[PDB]
Amino acid sequence: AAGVEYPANRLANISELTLNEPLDVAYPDEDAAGVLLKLGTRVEGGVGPDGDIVGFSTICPHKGFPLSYSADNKTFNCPGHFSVFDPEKGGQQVWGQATQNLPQYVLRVADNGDIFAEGVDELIYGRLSNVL
Amino acid sequence: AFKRHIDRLPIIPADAKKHNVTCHFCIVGCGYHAYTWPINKQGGTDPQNNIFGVDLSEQQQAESDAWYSPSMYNVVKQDGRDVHVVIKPDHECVVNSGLGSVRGARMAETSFSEARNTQQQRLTDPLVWRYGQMQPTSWDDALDLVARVTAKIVKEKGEDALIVSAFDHGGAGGGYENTWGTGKLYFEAMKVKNIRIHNRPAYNSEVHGTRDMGVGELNNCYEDAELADTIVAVGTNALETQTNYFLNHWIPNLRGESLGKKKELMPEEPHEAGRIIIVDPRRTVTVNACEQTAGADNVLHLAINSGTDLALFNALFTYIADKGWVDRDFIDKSTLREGTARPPLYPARGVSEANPGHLSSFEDAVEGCRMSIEEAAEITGLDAAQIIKAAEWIGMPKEGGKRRRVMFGYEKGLIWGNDNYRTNGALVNLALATGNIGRPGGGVVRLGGHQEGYVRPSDAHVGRPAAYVDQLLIGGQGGVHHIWGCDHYKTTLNAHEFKRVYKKRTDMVKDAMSAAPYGDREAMVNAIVDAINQGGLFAVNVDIIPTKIGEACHVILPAATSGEMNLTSMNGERRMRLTERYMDPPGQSMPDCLIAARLANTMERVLTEMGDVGYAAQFKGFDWQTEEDAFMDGYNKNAHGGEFVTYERLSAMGTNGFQEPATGFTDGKIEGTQRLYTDGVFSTDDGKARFMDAPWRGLQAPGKQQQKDSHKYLINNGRANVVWQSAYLDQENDFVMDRFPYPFIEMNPEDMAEAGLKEGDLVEIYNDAGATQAMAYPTPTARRGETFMLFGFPTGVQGNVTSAGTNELIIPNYKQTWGNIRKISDAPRNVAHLSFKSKEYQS
Amino acid sequence: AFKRHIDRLPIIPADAKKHNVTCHFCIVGCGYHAYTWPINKQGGTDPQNNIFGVDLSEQQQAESDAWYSPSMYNVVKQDGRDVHVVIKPDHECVVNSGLGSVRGARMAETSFSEARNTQQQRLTDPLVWRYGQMQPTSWDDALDLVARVTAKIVKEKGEDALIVSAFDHGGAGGGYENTWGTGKLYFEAMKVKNIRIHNRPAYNSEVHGTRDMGVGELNNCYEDAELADTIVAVGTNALETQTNYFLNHWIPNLRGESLGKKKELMPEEPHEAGRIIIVDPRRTVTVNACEQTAGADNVLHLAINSGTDLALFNALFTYIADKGWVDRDFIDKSTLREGTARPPLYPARGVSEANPGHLSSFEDAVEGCRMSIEEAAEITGLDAAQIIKAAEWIGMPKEGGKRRRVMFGYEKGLIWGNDNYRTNGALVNLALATGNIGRPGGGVVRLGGHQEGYVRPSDAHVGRPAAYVDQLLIGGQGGVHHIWGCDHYKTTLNAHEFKRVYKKRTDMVKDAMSAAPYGDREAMVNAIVDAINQGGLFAVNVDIIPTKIGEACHVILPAATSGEMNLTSMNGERRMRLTERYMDPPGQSMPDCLIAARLANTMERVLTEMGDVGYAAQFKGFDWQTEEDAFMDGYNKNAHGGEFVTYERLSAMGTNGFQEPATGFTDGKIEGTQRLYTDGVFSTDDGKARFMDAPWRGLQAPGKQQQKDSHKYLINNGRANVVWQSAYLDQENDFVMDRFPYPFIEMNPEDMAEAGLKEGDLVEIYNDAGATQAMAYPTPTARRGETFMLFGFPTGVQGNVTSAGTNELIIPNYKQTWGNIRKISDAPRNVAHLSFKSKEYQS
Ligand SMILES: Nc1nc2c(c(=O)[nH]1)N[C@H]1C(S)=C(S)[C@@H](COP(=O)(O)OP(=O)(O)OC[C@H]3O[C@@H](n4cnc5c(=O)[nH]c(N)nc54)[C@H](O)[C@@H]3O)O[C@H]1N2
Ligand SMILES: Nc1nc2c(c(=O)[nH]1)N[C@H]1C(S)=C(S)[C@@H](COP(=O)(O)OP(=O)(O)OC[C@H]3O[C@@H](n4cnc5c(=O)[nH]c(N)nc54)[C@H](O)[C@@H]3O)O[C@H]1N2
Ligand SMILES: Nc1nc2c(c(=O)[nH]1)N[C@H]1C(S)=C(S)[C@@H](COP(=O)(O)OP(=O)(O)OC[C@H]3O[C@@H](n4cnc5c(=O)[nH]c(N)nc54)[C@H](O)[C@@H]3O)O[C@H]1N2
Ligand SMILES: Nc1nc2c(c(=O)[nH]1)N[C@H]1C(S)=C(S)[C@@H](COP(=O)(O)OP(=O)(O)OC[C@H]3O[C@@H](n4cnc5c(=O)[nH]c(N)nc54)[C@H](O)[C@@H]3O)O[C@H]1N2
Ligand code: F3S
Ligand code: F3S
Ligand code: FES
Ligand SMILES: [Mo+4]
Ligand SMILES: [Mo+4]
Ligand SMILES: [O]
Ligand SMILES: [O]
């Protein structure tokens, strides 16, 4: 009751992830669009054997515009007001109108390689509680 | 990457108290509301229980009014109790339409909170240098010391011995109440000559040029950016620096969203989607955003050489004139037709330092300004076909022989740029020639910095040109310095030398005060004056935080900023709003206007005791008990149309307020002015605009050509979208300092590789003026030999390498700076976490 | 009153990680645990869901282990991640039994948190004075500069040109790792003589007296305070200054709770509730608490004249010896019998400055110290009856003529009191003569300040007396100053003159650095050395916050403190514990032992480059990569019983640890020493204790009698309960600063009436040494003419009015200070919310 109680939700398997191709996901419910993504390098918040699998809300924390991935620069890009987020560095706003770095998922890889989300490190766009 | 780990915010209840709030920060003046409610109450997820009448148990979609980010939430004191506060963009404000920038959206978390531990740097008490360090004291004690040293020094050496640095701007750290209070103390009660402004080292206008021509620099509305055929943006990075004016008004034009409104408001002519010329030596995120919303076809980025805008504009003026792409009726009806003789020293120098440009008719100006496409190409390093196309995009008529509508926008690339007076003039020539002033879709305007909130008694005594205050201080002149709401240590020109000497002179007074008895005040005062007489300086700082120049000051007085007080200001549209107090001043801090009144009251008492009742009587008229008293004595009595404006009337009109000047009051509505110069009568004795005979004469500020010639790199300088000004609040905001713990210097990747530099490295920029430090940020879009350093930044001050060079009117030529770059150290470990990717959005 | 409005805390979940934490702060070393768990997780009300195994949906009753305050909760970085943390007093620790002081209980709230915005003042980055202000830089760059300057100066002028100020204490800002690191650097690699300690301006001991007599000052156990017939408490305010020793051990003795234990551990002698003698000129909350728990009749408050302890002790020793109220057997078997000749200049002066007192037999010391009740009552201001009763409570055999058990505890009222050496000896005299060393219910002990964590090489080169470092600096000597974890601007003696000169000398070097190019590091170093050669000082600060003395320093190195590092230290009964690292250092901050190591690495590199390979080799043996390497190179190899102690074994023992020295390791337990000297073999060559022939000679430090006679009030000084030390953490803690924004000066209300003062008034304290400020606090229990000012406080430094005066061994006599008091200002507005009521508990 003091903190938000986060579901431990199954998102995908490590086998479902192609290098540099976002897998569309929802966490912590259906209406909280995000992605899983393998980056082929060890980075902040990264899980799996290479420590390169990250999970992010993919709804701009500025005004709720769906973000889009650039494979060449490995950045989320907002076509709303031109915000750029770096999922190699914990989803830092590289430039943008958000007062938040990109809300990022707490991932756990079980033995079978099934990937789980246990929480989010920032307030998701369009909900005043990450769990609704 | 910095994460708040705030999973959940309190819901604003249905019965929350609503306050109209204008953004504290930039010119755009985005509308917000502050909702406050008791700390032990909250809102419900059901419609009847929150402020939005919406079910918040359900995800909200893009552009929702029924959401706020963590930075929009805090807990603050109100009437001496903790309340929840949310500071949210107003969806119904015509300026922003519920947009908030990275800056305005953190008003709440950059507020002072004991409960949530935000901005504990905020000053709570008067501080005095005694017993060998800064010590908190009472207002009565601090004011008595300030007045006794001030009164003695001006009595003994004249008012010329009192030096003043002060804000002249609107919004937080400015505004009509605070400009009036400081203005009345130094210009009514006294005749202070040796006063400078927050951003320039003399008491001058940024834009004497446009003003001498009879064109006030804020002459249009924000709608005109939606209605223009072409936008000409000169030395503006509007997406970073005028963010929601660009996003809410320029973008719709460039994207065609505007076409429907154009056709409704101007049938009887053709309308395509807006195009844009961007005059800026550097490719910005503004150039990128424009390309990406209107396509490269509709965007002409003129990457001029540094400080050659005047050459470009004279060539556009020449070409447009020679084609007759001009509003003949406008020129004949509304501009000066009488020929007038060039000054003797023309074209090298004006008739005087006071008047560096020659005002004249259309025809005299064209022949004066006359420059070939070939020559501008040589100077600007543009291609002929770029300049000719720029001419066509401004001048060439639309299908039915109809006038092309052009909004001309400029800011500090021009104003802090080469030959301020002439460049400003050359740009006004283009808007005048094409009848793009006082018409829909037109204007030749500053895009602005702070909001505006200026009302002061006459400054006639100050002179033109006015005193170069920094040179007086560096040269060992003046006895007492009052500093209000500026920090020269981070933001003045020639800042390295300024600091060298400012420290020595304040150190002399510090040593004297450490060695003298404080509890016997008269002996303390005499030790101060004796130290001043050896070449010392007594410094008083009025601020909201411990400043960098404040580390040299002997007295600090704590100010209350916008939101802790009622504050009135207007935006780059002249849109006047009341920011309604929603919270308490921290500790004993008090509004600047009431500090001025209190210092005035103390000056009166001290001067009476010294036995000069006549001088003491000049310090009457300062019985204000609240900021509203300052509004009524100042704006209400002295502003054009002031008699129509009160707090109550301004409150009723909300975040849309009204455009100045006010013309009347009719059933709960102040009537305003959408556009200036609609009747073609300009701000001159006879009502005619003057053109400017403004010939190119190279880099006009002393030593600039030498500095270009004798150093390897251009140190271009200015704003980051994340950083507000000198990071006075940002330096205690983990979100901003997580992004840039060091000021970035944008460098070409090939330039970095040739200099043995990698991303994050700490580098010394050095030249004739001084030295400073920054973190190398690899920028593919940067031209080779051309760097950009974030200005005014506490962890590396760009001002240290800017020279003392000004134009004849003492305008600081910050942007034309060259220096060398060497390595200090490898990337510090605290930059390892930084993103070094392009700021440019990719489709 | 400051309220956090935190009406709900995250519950520790049942799988939270447990760390053993000794309190950061005072000597008592109360046991705590740090519970951390992942952000995004929490425990529940149900027993299986929380660490307590208890239904938290029920109200907990008094003294529950299943609660914590807001001050005990925070969010910190652990291994690069944000975790919840509760730092909670350990119920199973025998030191405190789940008690936390107002200081230990705010360990969490005074930890660095980006997420909760606590202690943002914490240093994250090296800083260097360049380009007109302090600038952040890399470890490589900052260490290089410190190394190059330190190396050049030492090589041209010798090691005597290096001045060091460093902690020698335990806990946060010391401990075995940190003292060893610093010690090895300046005593092994170098032979620095011009070194002082955090609390005294020479490299001396607080208590050469007790040590020269062969009695180590920490010779008992805390249980002794439970088992004693009489506690003798000299110059200690233990409720405020040794809170949980007082509360968890003295109190049980005074209200008879320990009687059961006394009868069991010591059968065949009588036992009643403990009585207490408090020797303190000031009536403290401790005196009040004692009266309240034991009854007025079991408390003898000897409110002596300031600085007259020695007279009282000599008189008690005389009375006790004449009555034969001594342990003949203890004296004959364990103390020196062979008489010895008084030195030439006795009684006024010892044989030398090195040896102020005469070490001798029992009988010789009785005759040398000989003083009558009549004389001591005249000197001390006590009734003859109070001194007789005190001799009876100390020496008179119990029913059946069983020896009375007496614990003699002293702290800074004696140590910073008049004639340190002889007063210390006179007290030890009383304990030796009564056989109250090495036995249950006995001891003659320092009650202590910080925890203890001293291990360093030989200091023999320092000499005795050692150099008065402050007088060196004030008199223009030394070239480089390394300052570790102390702030003389707030805490040294003669602090006004110290700051005046320290500012001047550091300014000379600041001015040079500002005019020199930094990018040419060789030019910079030259400018610095040239300024040093003109009488300037280059000053390097190793700390965790921006210090007051830091405002004068050229380089600042950020340190990590207890909890962000593993740390070992022992308490007032030698109970060694490991504080297990539970969080990360803020920013690039690093443990002091590792900064010492890194600086030694940099000295070696730099001395190689300079040629001198011989001098460079001396800085080898610093390859440490974690604090445990310092522990193993220092304590493990060099401490008495070190061989038996490792982190792993200390960890196993938890917050009860073991009492040093370690005698063995067996069955997973370090075997300790409950008491020293139980075999009556003392720390001299021949194993006998010496008595001290220690006659009263009035106020012994220079100028002290002159200062008393020429000033109106005693300015007594020392600690507040709420405040930890120089308020270095407390200054960014709203709970503390809300209580005392100014240091209090306790003043008799009649004294206030006479001087025209009201509660809260800002007063100046002034005398021959300097001047300072405090807030007047009406204190009915204050004797007329006697005031008490909070020491070390940032918003009014009491040190400013202490003289340079020391005893022959350079012991600062802070407690004997006299001054005048005059109003600066009526009670400031920021003090209106304060309670001015009595600090004394009422039934
Ligand atoms: N090289 C270079 N230098 C530049 C520029 C550049 O482009 N290049 N730009 C120039 C320009 S355009 C500007 S605006 C200047 C800015 O120069 P400054 O005015 O020195 O910079 P700010 O950070 O706006 O300073 C505002 C100060 O006012 C204080 N303050 C805020 N609110 C209040 C309030 O309510 N009351 C009081 N009393 N104080 C308050 C803040 O704490 C801070 O110290 O810099 C100029 N300097
Ligand atoms: N995010 C943010 N927004 C702000 C501020 C802030 O601190 N942060 N401050 C506000 C204030 S006080 C001000 S004054 C404005 C400043 O607003 P702008 O003037 O728009 O901003 P700057 O970054 O100072 O400079 C604008 C552009 O001038 C270009 N420039 C440099 N030299 C030349 C030259 O010779 N010719 C031309 N044509 N361009 C040149 C630079 O490359 C830069 O892109 O921003 C305001 N808004
Ligand atoms: N709350 C709190 N506790 C602390 C500290 C802290 O800052 N705050 N700091 C710790 C440290 S480092 C230390 S050294 C200890 C100090 O602990 P203490 O030594 O107990 O404390 P002080 O307040 O320095 O002085 C104790 C008493 O000495 C008395 N005194 C003054 N002059 C004389 C004199 O001539 N003779 C005698 N007999 N008494 C005299 C004063 O009236 C005062 O009550 O406390 C430790 N504990
Ligand atoms: N008039 C008068 N003066 C006195 C006394 C008195 O009774 N009367 N008492 C004396 C006594 S007993 C003492 S103990 C002294 C105290 O004198 P100081 O030692 O000057 O006082 P503290 O506040 O303990 O200073 C500790 C410093 O170390 C820093 N610090 C904390 N943790 C760490 C760490 O892990 N590493 C590093 N590098 N720094 C750290 C703190 O921020 C602070 O600046 O004052 C003395 N002064
Ligand atoms: S939110 Fe504030 S900073 Fe400028 S763009 Fe809008 S006014
Ligand atoms: S809690 Fe800490 S401050 Fe002393 S009394 Fe116990 S050790
Ligand atoms: S919604 Fe993404 S930048 Fe505005
Ligand atoms: Mo500006
Ligand atoms: Mo101490
Ligand atoms: O500005
Ligand atoms: O101490």
Numbering used by the authors:
A (entry chain D): 44 to 175
B (entry chain C), C (entry chain A): 2 to 844
Describing publication, verbatim:
The structure includes four copies of the AioAB assembly per asymmetric unit, arranged as two A2B2 heterotetramers. In addition to the two AioA2B2 complexes, there are four molecules of cytc 552 per asymmetric unit. The three cytc 552 molecules that lie at the AioA/AioB interface (chains I, J and K) are located such that the edge-to-edge distance between the [2Fe–2S] Rieske cluster in AioB and the heme in cytc 552 is 7.5 Å, which is consistent with fast electron transfer. Surface areas of 680 and 660 Å2 are buried on complex formation for the AioAB (350 Å2 for AioA and 330 Å2 for AioB) and cytc 552 proteins, respectively. The closest edge-to-edge distance between Cys103, which coordinates the Rieske cluster in AioB, and the vinyl group of heme in cytc 552 is 7.5 Å, which is well within the distance for fast electron transfer through the protein medium. HARLEM analysis of the coordinates of the complex predicts that the dominant electron-tunneling pathway from AioB to cytc 552 proceeds from the [2Fe–2S] Rieske cluster in the AioB subunit to Pro122 and across the protein–protein interface to the porphyrin ring and onto the heme iron, with Pro122 at a distance of 4.1 Å from the closest heme vinyl group. The unique cytc 552 (chain L) that associates between heterodimers shows edge-to-edge distances between the cytc 552 heme, the Moco (Mo atom) and the [3Fe–4S] cluster (residue Cys24) of AioA of 25 and 29 Å, respectively. The positioning of the unique cytc 552 in the complex therefore does not represent an electron transfer complex.
